[PDB]
């Protein structure tokens with residue numbers, strides 16, 4: 001999964017920011033959210049979010065669906081490392097398992113079930 | 116809900 005965010009921000013700057021944000025907000029996790037390449041649904045205006053550790057994937061889906069005005073017939077999937085995370089998983093659990101060495105979790109979203 | 120809103124997720 002290629003994240004444009006990494007082109008825009010060198011590793012050491014990301015890592016320094018991620019270390020600091022975890023100390024300031026230990027009950028939240030820092031996330032980079034990007035639309036998967038070629039997905040035909042709406043765009044966010046930011047990539048970097050700071051979400052509650054106890055927020056579930058399902059709650060995040062609900063918020064994105066309403067934020068980008070998805071229709072009922074529109075699908076919405078997340079991918080972490082090209083795999084759909086469980087809807088019941090919390091962000092904190094996904095962070096523990098999948099955070100990168102810059103201390104961020106990376107999530108792609110799409111209207112398709114394959115990244 | 117009253118806590119888990121879109122703005123809740125915003126980077127500070």
Ligand SMILES: *Cc1ccccc1C*
Nearest residue numbers: 052118119120123124
């Ligand atoms: C907005 C927010 C931040 C941290 C934990 C819970 C909630 C609802």
Ligand SMILES: [Cl-]
Nearest residue numbers: 120121122123
């Ligand atoms: Cl709000």
